[PDB]
Design an enzyme around this catalytic site. Sequence first.
Site, short mmCIF file in Angstrom:
data_model
loop_
_atom_site.label_atom_id
_atom_site.label_comp_id
_atom_site.label_asym_id
_atom_site.label_seq_id
_atom_site.Cartn_x
_atom_site.Cartn_y
_atom_site.Cartn_z
N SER A 43 -6.12 -4.25 -3.85
CA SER A 43 -6.19 -3.02 -4.64
C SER A 43 -7.34 -2.84 -5.66
CB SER A 43 -4.83 -2.78 -5.28
OG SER A 43 -3.82 -2.78 -4.28
N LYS A 46 -10.00 -0.10 -4.70
CA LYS A 46 -9.72 1.31 -4.96
C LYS A 46 -10.75 1.97 -5.89
CE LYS A 46 -4.84 0.84 -3.82
NZ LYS A 46 -3.42 1.13 -4.16
N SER A 103 -1.52 2.77 -8.56
CA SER A 103 -1.82 1.97 -7.36
C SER A 103 -1.20 2.51 -6.04
CB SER A 103 -1.48 0.50 -7.58
OG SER A 103 -2.47 -0.34 -6.97
N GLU A 139 -5.29 1.17 4.21
CA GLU A 139 -3.99 0.71 3.68
C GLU A 139 -2.89 0.91 4.73
OE1 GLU A 139 -5.16 -0.34 -0.52
OE2 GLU A 139 -3.52 -0.91 0.80
N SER A 210 -2.79 -6.98 -5.43
CA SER A 210 -1.79 -7.94 -4.94
C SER A 210 -1.76 -7.97 -3.42
CB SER A 210 -0.41 -7.60 -5.50
OG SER A 210 0.49 -8.69 -5.31
C1 LIG Z 1 -2.71 -3.40 -3.80
O1 LIG Z 1 -3.12 -4.56 -3.65
N1 LIG Z 1 -1.45 -3.08 -3.50
C2 LIG Z 1 -0.97 -1.73 -3.68
C3 LIG Z 1 -0.07 -1.92 -4.90
N2 LIG Z 1 -0.84 -2.39 -5.99
O2 LIG Z 1 -0.18 -2.12 -7.17
S1 LIG Z 1 -0.55 -3.21 -8.17
O3 LIG Z 1 -1.82 -3.02 -8.80
O4 LIG Z 1 0.38 -3.34 -9.26
O5 LIG Z 1 -0.62 -4.52 -7.60
C4 LIG Z 1 1.04 -2.93 -4.59
C5 LIG Z 1 0.47 -4.26 -4.10
C6 LIG Z 1 -0.54 -4.09 -2.99
C7 LIG Z 1 0.10 -3.67 -1.69
O6 LIG Z 1 0.47 -2.54 -1.54
N3 LIG Z 1 0.26 -4.63 -0.64
O7 LIG Z 1 0.85 -4.24 0.57
C8 LIG Z 1 0.18 -4.89 1.69
C9 LIG Z 1 0.23 -6.35 1.51
C10 LIG Z 1 1.19 -6.87 2.62
N4 LIG Z 1 1.12 -5.78 3.67
C11 LIG Z 1 0.86 -4.53 2.96
#
Ligand SMILES: *C(=O)N1C[C@H](NOS(=O)(=O)O)CC[C@H]1C(=O)NO[C@H]1CCNC1
Length: 259
Positions: A43, A46, A103, A139, A210
């Site tokens: 993320s 972005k 996010s 995504e 994440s």
């Molecule tokens: C980004 O890495 N994301 C989107 C969201 N980020 O919010 S956050 O900044 O608090 O971390 C949630 C985590 C991650 C995500 O969506 N991961 O989903 C993927 C990983 C496993 N398959 C789909």
Amino acid sequence: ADVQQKLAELERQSGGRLGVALINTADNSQILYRADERFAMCSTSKVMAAAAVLKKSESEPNLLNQRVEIKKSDLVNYNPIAEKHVNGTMSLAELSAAALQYSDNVAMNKLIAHVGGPASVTAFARQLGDETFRLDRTEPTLNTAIPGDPRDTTSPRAMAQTLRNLTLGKALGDSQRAQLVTWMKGNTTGAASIQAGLPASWVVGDKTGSGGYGTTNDIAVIWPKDRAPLILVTYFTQPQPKAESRRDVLASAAKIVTD
Ligand SMILES: *C(=O)N1C[C@H](NOS(=O)(=O)O)CC[C@H]1C(=O)NO[C@H]1CCNC1
């Protein structure tokens, strides 16, 4: 020196791979730990997608007000703002806000689509100078973070240089630079990350990430109280496949490079 040793102890304790890159705009100093090694952004990417749309709005006035349709099919793993706008519309400024502050992955997908795919996001990084940044998937696939896989990765140094140019430099226009900074300042997802290891009086503008294999990331433009800004990039990945999130490591890493 002391900072390189202190980060190495933290990496040892965490049992993973830590990537730290800090730039002090006052005297152009750098703290670099695994700055050249490739880490999956997840993320934190972005920001680049938001900036690509921001750079586009320089040649396209009223672009950020253009409405984008949000359908049920568009919905993926995590979409906090987009799920509330299903069978409706969201402006490009709103999609940028949702992607950076909340996010939202659907919002991130709309930003990628608007610039012409993930390859166009990578094309925008080469335009700024970043020859490390690469976005190969959309995504949610871009957050797999498989050890050895170069897809959707960058080095902490390159991301720190690029964030410096986007938030404090001349990569974007004065109006556009002010907007990215405002959005990043309004982040809700980075309370327990980098911001956790810095004093309360410091103004932070960040993006969090994440991914798979316990990948926990954060990129931030920090304004220390009464002093010249700092750019910090803390990237972290673990060996176990479904390893739990370790945002504390990023906090300790931030604490080590500032204290
Ligand atoms: C980004 O890495 N994301 C989107 C969201 N980020 O919010 S956050 O900044 O608090 O971390 C949630 C985590 C991650 C995500 O969506 N991961 O989903 C993927 C990983 C496993 N398959 C789909």
